Design a binder for this molecule. Structure first.
Ligand SMILES: [Mg+2]
Ligand SMILES: [Mg+2]
Ligand SMILES: [Mg+2]
Ligand SMILES: [Mg+2]
Ligand SMILES: [Mg+2]
Ligand SMILES: [Mg+2]
Ligand SMILES: [Mg+2]
Ligand SMILES: [Mg+2]
Ligand SMILES: [Mg+2]
Ligand SMILES: [Mg+2]
Ligand SMILES: [Mg+2]
Ligand SMILES: [Mg+2]
Ligand SMILES: [Mg+2]
Ligand SMILES: [Mg+2]
Ligand SMILES: [Mg+2]
Ligand SMILES: [Mg+2]
Ligand SMILES: [Mg+2]
Ligand SMILES: [Mg+2]
Ligand SMILES: [Mg+2]
Ligand SMILES: [Mg+2]
Ligand SMILES: [Mg+2]
Ligand SMILES: [Mg+2]
Ligand SMILES: [Mg+2]
Ligand SMILES: [Mg+2]
Ligand SMILES: [Mg+2]
Ligand SMILES: [Mg+2]
Ligand SMILES: [Mg+2]
Ligand SMILES: [Mg+2]
Ligand SMILES: [Mg+2]
Ligand SMILES: [Mg+2]
Ligand SMILES: [Mg+2]
Ligand SMILES: [Mg+2]
Ligand SMILES: [Mg+2]
Ligand SMILES: [Mg+2]
Ligand SMILES: [Mg+2]
Ligand SMILES: [Mg+2]
Ligand SMILES: [Mg+2]
Ligand SMILES: [Mg+2]
Ligand SMILES: [Mg+2]
Ligand SMILES: [Mg+2]
Ligand SMILES: [Mg+2]
Ligand SMILES: [Mg+2]
Ligand SMILES: [Mg+2]
Ligand SMILES: [Mg+2]
Ligand SMILES: [Mg+2]
Ligand SMILES: [Mg+2]
Ligand SMILES: [Mg+2]
Ligand SMILES: [Mg+2]
Ligand SMILES: [Mg+2]
Ligand SMILES: [Mg+2]
Ligand SMILES: [Mg+2]
Ligand SMILES: [Mg+2]
Ligand SMILES: [Mg+2]
Ligand SMILES: [Mg+2]
Ligand SMILES: [Mg+2]
Ligand SMILES: [Mg+2]
Ligand SMILES: [Zn+2]
Lengths: 65, 98, 63
RNA sequence: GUUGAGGCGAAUUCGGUGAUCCUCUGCUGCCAAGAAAAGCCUCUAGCGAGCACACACACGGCCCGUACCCCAAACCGACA
RNA sequence: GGGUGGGGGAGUGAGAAUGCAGGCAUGAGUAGCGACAAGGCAAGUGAGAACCUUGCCCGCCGAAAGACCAAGGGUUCCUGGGCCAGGCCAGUCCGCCCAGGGUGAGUCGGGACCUAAGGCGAGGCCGACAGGCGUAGUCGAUGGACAACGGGUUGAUAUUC
RNA sequence: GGAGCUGUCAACCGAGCGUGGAUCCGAGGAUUUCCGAAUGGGGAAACCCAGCACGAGUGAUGUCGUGCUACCCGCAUCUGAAUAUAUAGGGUGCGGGAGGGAACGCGGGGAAGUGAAACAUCUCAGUACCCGUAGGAGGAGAAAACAAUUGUGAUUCCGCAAGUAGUGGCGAGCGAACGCGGAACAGGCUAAACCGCACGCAUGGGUAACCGGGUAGGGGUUGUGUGUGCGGGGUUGUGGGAGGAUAUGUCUCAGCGCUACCCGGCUGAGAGGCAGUCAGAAAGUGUCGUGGUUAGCGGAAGUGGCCUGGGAUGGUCUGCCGUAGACGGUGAGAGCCCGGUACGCGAAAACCCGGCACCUGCCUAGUAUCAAUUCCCGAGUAGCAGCGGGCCCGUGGAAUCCGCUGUGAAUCCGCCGGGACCACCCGGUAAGCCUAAAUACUCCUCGAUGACCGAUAGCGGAUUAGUACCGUGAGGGAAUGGU
């Protein structure tokens, strides 16, 4: 998973693009799991956690980091 | 904060009825139960870059099961049935050939 | 009628009524509340209040 | 015809009888004298520089219910 | 986990309260097995068949014992399995148990439209407190307004596809 | 903190993470659907439908995201209906409330069963219940008090006094105080007279004879008199203040008080002293703690022999520690096997407490003497009468205290109390406010304990427990532990 330390250099738009990419990846993983071709089921939790990480970074950046 | 259409569409429905509809080019999804038809249509068009003819929705109550002494209820779901425009590019479900 | 005074807030009192055989039953002591149309300035608009005769006897209100 | 699905497919005229239905929120009679509001139409107050209409094309039509029992073994009666 | 001795303290002794809780007898393999429509044979399945499946007879309802709703119920619906509990007998069957599936609406019934009886009720009036009543208003169908018919299809939905 | 981990019934798997520090423990922050006081409107709680603003999206309606939008109260501002003054009302902006909680507090309303061997007075009992409203406690609290020839000196709580004096269909019952011994101690602000200052009114609407007093003039008109507010002054019972005459300037300075002078006085500033999060004024900001709380770490001594045994922690020989022989686990009674125990270390950060500064505010001459002429000392109050309540006191000769109705005072030569009342004497100073501690309780959080229970017991609840089930509902409410 992407680390907060290496996340904290993207300014705002790179963070937003990363969040969009992560949401798309999570969507794809959900579909693959639904149709039964996903083997490593830990990927869903990993992607959910990195989405939460990006959201946390954005929010704390807004609220006087 | 920023809303993504992929938050509305959860997963595709895989069953004999869904496979039958796939030949007719009609796709069944599980959607977030609070969504409405127009929002679903907009979201599908955005996600798959496709043209949508109409959206059909249905709410299904969860089944009740008993485990050792009492009853527990599964979650209720909402299904959206989406029919593409007459001549649109098919949606590639990525593992649902029917 | 209207057992509470609008100015001093005086309310009813509770006690007993005692007969010849000394049977005691509950009753009330109500203040002598009278209707008054009170003006704030000379020639002003009148307002209806419920005040007690003690407040009337004192210069607490004016017609 | 694995008795599932398939393929083909004629003639279809004239009478009788006849409503608890329709014309009929009508008609006739009677006294016991028989909802409201929206909707629709119209009047002006008002607004007003752009309008109203015809045709064609392309579109938007939301939320909940929809399974099954329902003079019953699935409802009310502790019970098929 | 106990015995004995010197002391200390008790929720310290049950056979009866038409006592309470649990277990178990007697009645007894006894009564009953829930309408007066009625069942039979052949074949099948199976370890097991009066009751399940198929066929053919016979009988009963037919202003219902047929076909649709509303209220109510809530997965009882379909498919595939099951057979120690349940079904007043047995059961291979099931409204029972297990898994998966299944309910598609611009026009149907409702809301987003309207109001009745009635409910709540800004201010308000009344009432020691608690509170009572009620205006503006806002809810409230069993009523008003408002646009669809015929056919086909699934194991399971259809005026919805 | 240091090697495993992905909670449990509750296993089976599957797939992964971890010394580049996982899981886990503590603190702070972020996220936080919908309902609920629920508050944009509606509603059968967890559902429905919006308005405005800003963004997103669409060919455009549709659609999405985020904020704000209840009512009432207070304050500040704009407007001033009928209607003129104006007010009601309305708009805008700021604050505040609402509801919940096991017990404890305070104020108000207030049963019956029962006892009286019946029963109404009485009791039960100011209990149960209800309403209002708090706080970590609350209420009370600083003498208009007791006492009695002496004196004590705010309040509260505990033990006595005492089942006493008394009271009572003198029945059943009920039941003080004085004073004594203790716990804990604490006292402070105001109103009023008077003097100034601002709004308002009468009068001279100029004869104010006032403008700091006076020493003489100056404008001679703004003085004079009261109400509303802000300052100063005042706070006492041996009465005290206000007002007068002898009697003086924490320290200084700028202004001003009509002018030249004495004495001033006022405002502002600087200089010093004091106090401070407090009842006596209210906040905030840094820094420092041998400070404390919220994770934790270390911590001595048997692999001893033999016997029995599945197994030693048992028996018997032995060795040792002990500031540690608490408790529990481990294949049977373990100080030396394990977690631990005695004892000792430990805090980024947050919070609590304390200290020091910043900061805040108060003090800027009045002390005494005399005068006894005047003013003030909390009003529809006290007192009195009627009807009640409560005090040991059940209306009695009934004081003291509280309520309603009526009548209705005075300011120290006043007024109130000392159990009808009167005279004398003694005490005190009502009708304004605040106040720590000693006292009450435990929903809850830690740490302990038991001549308490041990599964029909102990909580209803060791088990799916306020669950299953019963009831329309308010409510009622189980059973089931052990290889
Ligand atoms: Mg979110
Ligand atoms: Mg359609
Ligand atoms: Mg639908
Ligand atoms: Mg089942
Ligand atoms: Mg009132
Ligand atoms: Mg009584
Ligand atoms: Mg009076
Ligand atoms: Mg249907
Ligand atoms: Mg149907
Ligand atoms: Mg029905
Ligand atoms: Mg039944
Ligand atoms: Mg024995
Ligand atoms: Mg003994
Ligand atoms: Mg006994
Ligand atoms: Mg016995
Ligand atoms: Mg017995
Ligand atoms: Mg017999
Ligand atoms: Mg028989
Ligand atoms: Mg039968
Ligand atoms: Mg046979
Ligand atoms: Mg069936
Ligand atoms: Mg069977
Ligand atoms: Mg049987
Ligand atoms: Mg009402
Ligand atoms: Mg109201
Ligand atoms: Mg109404
Ligand atoms: Mg309605
Ligand atoms: Mg209707
Ligand atoms: Mg059907
Ligand atoms: Mg944590
Ligand atoms: Mg609401
Ligand atoms: Mg509401
Ligand atoms: Mg006016
Ligand atoms: Mg409260
Ligand atoms: Mg009685
Ligand atoms: Mg009696
Ligand atoms: Mg008796
Ligand atoms: Mg508090
Ligand atoms: Mg207090
Ligand atoms: Mg003063
Ligand atoms: Mg004053
Ligand atoms: Mg340790
Ligand atoms: Mg051995
Ligand atoms: Mg042991
Ligand atoms: Mg031990
Ligand atoms: Mg006084
Ligand atoms: Mg009196
Ligand atoms: Mg009395
Ligand atoms: Mg008396
Ligand atoms: Mg009086
Ligand atoms: Mg005397
Ligand atoms: Mg007080
Ligand atoms: Mg105290
Ligand atoms: Mg028990
Ligand atoms: Mg036992
Ligand atoms: Mg029920
Ligand atoms: Zn009054």
């Amino acid at each position: 998973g992407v680390s907060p330390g290496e996340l904290r250099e993207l300014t705002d738009e790179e963070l937003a693009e990363r969040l969009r990419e992560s949401k798309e990846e999570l969507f794809n993983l959900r579909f693959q799991m639904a149709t039964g071709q996903l083997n490593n089921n830990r990927r869903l939790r990993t992607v959910r956690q990195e989405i939460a990480r990006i959201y946390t970074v954005l929010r704390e950046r807004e609220l006087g980091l | 904060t920023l809303a993504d259409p992929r938050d509305i569409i959860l997963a595709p429905v895989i069953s004999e009825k869904s496979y039958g509809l796939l030949d007719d080019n009609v796709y069944t999804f599980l959607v977030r139960p609070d969504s409405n038809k127009t929002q679903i249509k907009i979201a599908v068009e955005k996600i798959f870059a496709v043209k949508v003819a109409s959206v059909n929705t249905a709410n299904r109550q969860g089944k009740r099961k008993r485990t050792r002494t009492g009853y527990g209820k599964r979650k209720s779901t909402k299904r959206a049935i989406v029919t593409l425009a007459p001549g649109s590019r098919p949606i590639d479900l990525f593992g649902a050939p029917a | 009628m209207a057992a509470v005074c609008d100015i001093c807030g005086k309310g009813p009192g509770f006690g007993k009524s005692v007969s010849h055989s000394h049977r005691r039953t509950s009753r009330r002591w109500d203040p002598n509340i009278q209707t008054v149309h009170a003006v704030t300035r000379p020639g002003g608009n009148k307002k209806r209040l419920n005040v007690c005769t003690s407040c009337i006897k004192a210069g607490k209100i004016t017609r």
